[PDB]
Amino acid sequence: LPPNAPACMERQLEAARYRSDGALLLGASSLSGRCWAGSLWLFKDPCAAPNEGFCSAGVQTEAGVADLTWVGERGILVASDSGAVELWELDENETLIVSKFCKYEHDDIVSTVSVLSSGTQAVSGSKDICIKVWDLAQQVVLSSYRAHAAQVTCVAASPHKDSVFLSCSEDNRILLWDTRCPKPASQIGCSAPGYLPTSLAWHPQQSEVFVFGDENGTVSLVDTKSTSCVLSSAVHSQCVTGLVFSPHSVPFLASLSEDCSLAVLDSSLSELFRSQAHRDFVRDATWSPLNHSLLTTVGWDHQVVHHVVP
Amino acid sequence: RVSSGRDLNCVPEIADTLGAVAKQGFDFLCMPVFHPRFKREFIQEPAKNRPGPQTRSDLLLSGRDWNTLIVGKLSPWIRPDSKVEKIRRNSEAAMLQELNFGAYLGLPAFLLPLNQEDNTNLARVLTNHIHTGHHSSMFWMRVPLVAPEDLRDDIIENAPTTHTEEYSGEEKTWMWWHNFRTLCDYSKRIAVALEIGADLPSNHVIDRWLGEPIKAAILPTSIFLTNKKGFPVLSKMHQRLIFRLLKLEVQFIITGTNHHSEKEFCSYLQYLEYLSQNRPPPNAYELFAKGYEDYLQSPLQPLMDNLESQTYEVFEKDPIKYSQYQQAIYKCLLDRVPEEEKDTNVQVLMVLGAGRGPLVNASLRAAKQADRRIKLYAVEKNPNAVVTLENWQFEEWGSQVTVVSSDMREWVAPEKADIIVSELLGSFADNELSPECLDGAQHFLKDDGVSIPGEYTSFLAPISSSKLYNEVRACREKDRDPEAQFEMPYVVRLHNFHQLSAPQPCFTFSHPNRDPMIDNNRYCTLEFPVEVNTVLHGFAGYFETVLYQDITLSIRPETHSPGMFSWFPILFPIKQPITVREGQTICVRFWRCSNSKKVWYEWAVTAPVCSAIHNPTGRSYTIGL
Ligand SMILES: CSC[C@H]1O[C@@H](n2cnc3c(N)ncnc32)[C@H](O)[C@@H]1O
Ligand SMILES: CCn1c(N)nc2cccnc21
Numbered sequence: 001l002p003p004n005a006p007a008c009m010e011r012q013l014e015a016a017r018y019r020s021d022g023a024l025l026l027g028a029s030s031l032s033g034r035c036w037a038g039s040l041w042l043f044k045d046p047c048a049a050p051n052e053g054f055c056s057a058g059v060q061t062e063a064g065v066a067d068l069t070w071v072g073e074r075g076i077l078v079a080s081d082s083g084a085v086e087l088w089e090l091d092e093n094e095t096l097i098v099s100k101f102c103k104y105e106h107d108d109i110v111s112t113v114s115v116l117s118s119g120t121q122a123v124s125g126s127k128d129i130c131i132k133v134w135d136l137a138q139q140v141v142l143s144s145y146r147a148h149a150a151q152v153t154c155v156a157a158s159p160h161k162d163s164v165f166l167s168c169s170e171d172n173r174i175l176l177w178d179t180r181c182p183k184p185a186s187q188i189g190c191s192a193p194g195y196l197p198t199s200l201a202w203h204p205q206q207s208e209v210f211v212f213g214d215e216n217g218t219v220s221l222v223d224t225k226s227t228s229c230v231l232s233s234a235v236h237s238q239c240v241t242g243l244v245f246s247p248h249s250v251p252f253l254a255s256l257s258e259d260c261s262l263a264v265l266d267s268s269l270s271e272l273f274r275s276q277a278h279r280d281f282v283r284d285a286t287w288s289p290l291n292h293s294l295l296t297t298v299g300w301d302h303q304v305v306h307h308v309v310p
Numbered sequence: 311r312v313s314s315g316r317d318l319n320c321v322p323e324i325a326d327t328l329g330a331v332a333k334q335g336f337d338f339l340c341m342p343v344f345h346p347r348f349k350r351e352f353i354q355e356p357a358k359n360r361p362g363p364q365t366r367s368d369l370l371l372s373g374r375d376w377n378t379l380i381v382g383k384l385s386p387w388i389r390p391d392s393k394v395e396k397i398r399r400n401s402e403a404a405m406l407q408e409l410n411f412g413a414y415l416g417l418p419a420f421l422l423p424l425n426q427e428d429n430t431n432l433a434r435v436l437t438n439h440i441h442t443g444h445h446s447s448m449f450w451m452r453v454p455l456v457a458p459e460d461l462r463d464d465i466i467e468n469a470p471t472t473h474t475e476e477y478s479g480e481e482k483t484w485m486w487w488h489n490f491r492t493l494c495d496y497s498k499r500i501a502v503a504l505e506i507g508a509d510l511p512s513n514h515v516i517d518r519w520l521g522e523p524i525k526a527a528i529l530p531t532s533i534f535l536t537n538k539k540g541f542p543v544l545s546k547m548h549q550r551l552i553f554r555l556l557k558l559e560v561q562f563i564i565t566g567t568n569h570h571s572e573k574e575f576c577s578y579l580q581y582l583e584y585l586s587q588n589r590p591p592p593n594a595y596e597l598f599a600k601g602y603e604d605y606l607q608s609p610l611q612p613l614m615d616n617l618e619s620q621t622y623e624v625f626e627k628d629p630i631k632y633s634q635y636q637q638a639i640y641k642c643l644l645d646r647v648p649e650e651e652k653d654t655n656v657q658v659l660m661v662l663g664a665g666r667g668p669l670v671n672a673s674l675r676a677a678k679q680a681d682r683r684i685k686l687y688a689v690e691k692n693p694n695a696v697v698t699l700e701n702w703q704f705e706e707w708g709s710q711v712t713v714v715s716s717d718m719r720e721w722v723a724p725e726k727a728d729i730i731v732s733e734l735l736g737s738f739a740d741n742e743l744s745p746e747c748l749d750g751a752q753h754f755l756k757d758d759g760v761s762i763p764g765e766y767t768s769f770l771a772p773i774s775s776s777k778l779y780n781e782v783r784a785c786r787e788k789d790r791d792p793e794a795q796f797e798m799p800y801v802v803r804l805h806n807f808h809q810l811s812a813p814q815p816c817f818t819f820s821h822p823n824r825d826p827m828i829d830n831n832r833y834c835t836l837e838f839p840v841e842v843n844t845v846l847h848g849f850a851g852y853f854e855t856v857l858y859q860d861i862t863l864s865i866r867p868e869t870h871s872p873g874m875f876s877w878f879p880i881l882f883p884i885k886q887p888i889t890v891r892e893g894q895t896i897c898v899r900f901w902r903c904s905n906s907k908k909v910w911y912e913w914a915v916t917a918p919v920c921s922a923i924h925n926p927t928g929r930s931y932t933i934g935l
Contacts, residue, residue: 029345029347031345031347031348032345032348032362032363032364032365032366033363033366034323034324034366034367034370035322035323036320036321036322036323036345036366037322062322063320063322064345064347066347080320081319081320081322081346081347082320083320083566083567104567104568105567106567107530107531107532107565107566107567108319108566109319109320109346109347127319127346127386128566129458145463145465146461146462146463146465147462147463147465147466148462149457149458149459149461149462150425150458151386171458171459173466173469175466181467183464183465183466183467184465185465185466185467185469186466186467186468187466187468187469195393195394215392215394215397216394237354237396238354238396239397258349258351258357259354260356260357279356279357279359280356280357280360281349281357300360
């Protein structure tokens with residue numbers, strides 16, 4: 001365990017995010033026992049995780065980590081139980097992780113963060129039902145939207161548009177946002193109201209299509225243009241928690257669920273691979289930037305698993 | 311002053327959090343019992359076999375703390391009414407699990423959301439927990455004044471917020487509560503935590519909650535303004551609501567993060583304390599009537615029963631009442647003896663029901679004020695009280711007062727009276743049988759004689775109170791009709807309630823009663839125009855009496871005798887609450903019925919729907935003759 005690094009890492013592995021160079025960001029919460037808190041870890045050897053004494057850097061957070069994102073190559077933006085979005089800065093040598101800002105702006109658990117293509121703004125979502133837009137450089141809220149009527153599940157910034165992002169909520173609304181419009185939110189999605197939406201991922205190339213997953217284990221491919229529901233497969237036996245596209249030319253879709261399984265899908269939403277490796281809830285997936293056939297999953301069973309995708 | 315608590319959905323260490331919020335001045339803390347994000351599987355492998363512990367140890371506080379400082383919170387992922395079968399099944403198991411844990415810990419309350427319209431399966435699961443062992447702990451149902459869907463910013467281009475006037479629609483949150491509670495059959499353990507937003511709705515929407523069991527009001531940090539010196543404060547209208555809620559003595563809950571940074575969370579709290587300490591301090595009645603609020607009592611029946619010495623003590627402790635009686639007799643004397651006759655003319659004044667004598671003394675104070683001459687009889691059937699009278703007449707009054715220990719209906723008077731004075735009146739005027747008593751006595755009033763009082767009139771007003779309906783319902787007793795509670799009047803300081811319509815006169819009596827054939831039975835029909843949506847639970851009764859000419863007594867709110875604490879309102883319940891819609895008329899029917907033995911009231915609501923006739927034949931309630 002490096003300087004400023006905890007002897008022990010919280011059990012519930014919540015977030016897994018490869019940097020450009022192949023180094024691994026871990027968020028983890030304590031969701032049980034005396035202390036309900038969380039931690040951030042850097043693993044420059046990704047094969048050494050989750051083991052705490054084989055880590056490049058680690059730190060204790062006041063509260064649990066609901067969501068995580070890299071900001072470029074040294075920033076960590078953190079969605080807290082505390083109602084705070086917090087910005088953790090890396091060290092020069094990259095041996096410790098240090099608080100840069102911690103802002104108590106939400107009235108409930110911050111459930112979801114995304115960095116906008118800019119790199120200088122992010123959007124959080126919360127159980128307080130609000131969606132906030134953040135100047136990271138200035139450490140403030142620019143916008144704050146009560147679009148929804150229930151808790152916000154997911155917020156995903158468009159790849160290339162710093163004024164565009166998706167949100168979804170238990171109010172059964174998927175919102176396409178564009179902050180340039182005086183009414184920024186536009187309610188999008190299939191013909192009929194279906195099952196609550198639980199997960200969102202923009203296609204990395206075609207920035208007018210995205211996939212959403214619902215609480216009934218169906219993954220669905222949507223076109224903003226034709227504003228109608230293209231393809232959908234019943235992939236999981238429980239709520240789809242995360243959707244992650246590979247870095248590939250024609251990219252693969254990694255699908256994770258509370259059914260504890262991983263699926264990897266082609267463009268037509270057909271099943272290629274599937275991993276039972278986990279024996280609790282699967283929480284995140286990142287594709288190695290170094291090996292685009294490597295897919296790394298974490299779960300509440302505290303397993304860091306490296307998948308080879310054929 | 312104010313009892314208030316902190317609502318949190320983040321507790322890293324329960325030790326520190328509790329200390330912190332105590333440091334800040336909170337009486338208690340609302341918090342999760344399981345980690346809000348810790349979704350649990352009960353059916354599907356492998357997640358089901360998740361190695362424990364399932365939450366943090368009960369050893370982390372004292373029994374006493376769990377009992378007094380902690381309110382539990384249902385986890386927010388728990389959705390018993392989910393349309394997804396598997397989410398519904400886990401949410402049932404988890405809701406049970408979490409409720410059973412609160413009960414294990416002996417928590418004094420536990421918070422559950424009504425955050426949508428359909429809470430049927432939630433209701434079903436709660437009702438089961440309640441029907442598993444008899445416990446005291448409360449369920450605080452977290453309901454918004456204004457549904458979140460009707461609070462949302464108008465920022466969805468293709469989904470605009472309708473600004474069409476919406477009478478019933480704006481009341482939808484009351485219907486969520488109403489339906490939930492009706493499913494749970496009005497359990498006394500299920501109450502309201504009213505969540506208040508930046509936008510107060512219409513006053514009709516607030517009026518919906520008047521009669522309801524509100525235990526807590528949740529105030530988000532959000533809704534506090536900032537003043538010049540950066541202190542959190544509230545809009546004049548938020549303040550009005552707080553003042554209304556202080557009168558109902560609820561507990562306040564501060565929820566959300568600090569939005570007034572260079573100030574502690576005690577700044578919110580100090581504001582509330584500030585508002586309570588800066589409320590109009592309570593009048594004499596409001597202090598007298600304080601402990602008695604929504605407390606149901608049997609009406610006195612001082613004809614059929616001999617009142618206790620301390621009952622007469624409290625009658626005597628109402629000087630405004632006797633000032634009025636002094637003044638009525640005062641005036642009646644002057645009207646009856648001219649100044650040229652003052653010394654040749656001595657008026658026979660008979661107190662009929664003289665108790666321990668304050669009416670006798672008032673008569674005495676009246677005569678020396680009027681400078682006119684009076685002979686008293688003090689007639690009392692309670693022989694215990696006669697003891698007080700006869701010790702008074704020996705030691706003080708001397709023979710100006712003849713004490714008569716008999717029933718006024720039976721007594722043979724040595725002579726006829728110029729004036730009879732009585733205070734034979736209950737909260738519904740004639741409910742102590744003043745008519746029958748005075749009718750029986752009238753043969754010994756001179757053909758030109760005055761009764762004080764000359765007249766009394768009862769009034770009724772329909773009320774909403776789910777609180778009082780529930781209190782009545784809980785007065786079931788072994789070895790009588792299971793519904794007898796509902797077929798009898800209660801005297802009560804009506805407090806948590808809504809008057810649905812202005813009172814209207816019910817029954818009136820006049821003394822002396824000239825009628826050739828006197829008949830004290832009655833049948834009245836009353837129509838109460840109602841300008842709100844509501845639920846009828848019963849009828850408040852009040853009365854007015856004319857002592858003499860312009861001198862009166864009243865508990866009718868519009869004409870209440872000021873600073874007179876005698877006679878709380880009366881309450882006629884109904885067995886089944888009746889939904890009433892704005893514009894509809896409530897029609898109620900009241901009878902006064904009798905034998906030689908007993909007098910009673912019967913009553914029926916006939917609009918907007920019919921009730922059963924209440925108390926047919928006096929089968930649940932009668933007044934002895
Ligand atoms: C001061 S409360 C009314 C009083 O009137 C007395 N009272 C009631 N009815 C009668 C009656 N019919 N004859 C004489 N006293 C009565 C009661 O015992 C009580 O003290
Ligand atoms: C003393 C007058 N009185 C009667 N007759 N019944 C009463 C109930 C309450 C207060 N005063 C009362």
